[PDB]
Amino acid sequence: SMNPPPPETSNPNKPKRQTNQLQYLLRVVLKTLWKHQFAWPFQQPVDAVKLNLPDYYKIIKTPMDMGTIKKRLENNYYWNAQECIQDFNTMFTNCYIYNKPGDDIVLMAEALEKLFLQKINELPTEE
Ligand SMILES: CCS(=O)(=O)Cc1cnc(Oc2ccc(F)cc2F)c(-c2cc(C)c3n2CC=NC3=O)c1
């Protein structure tokens, strides 16, 4: 029940790097999913307290949300686009695990994972 501490967004000793693709993940991919009608549930960590889901963090062990993605991008916390894409994947996977097919939150996710996959089909090249 009690809310764990969010995932970190800055880490002095982690190798950081700004690539063209990482720039794209924030400027085009993150910031177009953000505006979607179904983004809001995923714009910050899940508050198992506010929602009264004391079991969320007992089932979800790697939490992830577009809020901590947007914070990680803007902090250039990532080394390459793939680790940022992995955090999106974890976010969706989390939602399909704690929930079951047909739930409204899954519908929002399944959709967002569709929009996400369509937007990252074509990433920029490196200089
Ligand atoms: C994120 C801060 S917050 O204060 O908690 C706002 C918030 C409100 N409602 C939520 O659930 C629904 C969201 C839309 C629905 F149509 C129906 C929900 F039950 C959620 C939320 C986000 C995520 C990933 C999940 N949930 C709920 C259950 N499982 C989840 O995996 C979050």
From Swiss-Prot:
Changing N99A: Abolishes binding to acetylated histones. Ubiquitously expressed. Phosphorylation by CK2 disrupt the intramolecular binding between the bromo domain 2 and the NPS region and promotes binding between the NPS and the BID regions, leading to activate the protein and promote binding to acetylated histones. In absence of phosphorylation, BRD4 does not localize to p53/TP53 target gene promoters, phosphorylation promoting recruitment to p53/TP53 target promoters. It is linked to Cornelia de Lange syndrome 6: A form of Cornelia de Lange syndrome, a clinically heterogeneous developmental disorder associated with malformations affecting multiple systems. It is characterized by facial dysmorphisms, abnormal hands and feet, growth delay, cognitive retardation, hirsutism, gastroesophageal dysfunction and cardiac, ophthalmologic and genitourinary anomalies. CDLS6 inheritance is autosomal dominant. A chromosomal aberration involving BRD4 is found in a rare, aggressive, and lethal carcinoma arising in midline organs of young people. Translocation t(15;19)(q14;p13) with NUTM1 which produces a BRD4-NUTM1 fusion protein. Interacts with p53/TP53; the interaction is direct. Interacts (via CTD region) with CDK9 and CCNT1, acting as an associated component of P-TEFb complex. Interacts with RELA (when acetylated at 'Lys-310'). Interacts (via NET domain) with NSD3, CHD4, BICRA and ATAD5. The interaction with BICRA bridges BRD4 to the GBAF complex. Interacts (via NET domain) with JMJD6 (via JmjC and N-terminal domains); the interaction is stronger in presence of ssRNA and recruits JMJD6 on distal enhancers. Interacts with NSD3. Interacts with NIPBL. (Microbial infection) Interacts with bovine papillomavirus type 1 regulatory protein E2. This interactions may serve for the tethering of viral genomes to host mitotic chromosomes allowing successful partitioning of the viral genome during cell division. Chromatin reader protein that recognizes and binds acetylated histones and plays a key role in transmission of epigenetic memory across cell divisions and transcription regulation. Remains associated with acetylated chromatin throughout the entire cell cycle and provides epigenetic memory for postmitotic G1 gene transcription by preserving acetylated chromatin status and maintaining high-order chromatin structure. During interphase, plays a key role in regulating the transcription of signal-inducible genes by associating with the P-TEFb complex and recruiting it to promoters. The NET domain mediates interaction with a number of chromatin proteins involved in transcription regulation (NSD3, JMJD6, CHD4, GLTSCR1 and ATAD5). The C-terminal (CTD) region mediates interaction and recruitment of CDK9 and CCNT1 subunits of the P-TEFb complex. It is also required for maintenance of higher-order chromatin structure. This is Bromodomain-containing protein 4. It comes from Homo sapiens (Human). The chain holds residues 44 to 168 of 1362 of the full protein.
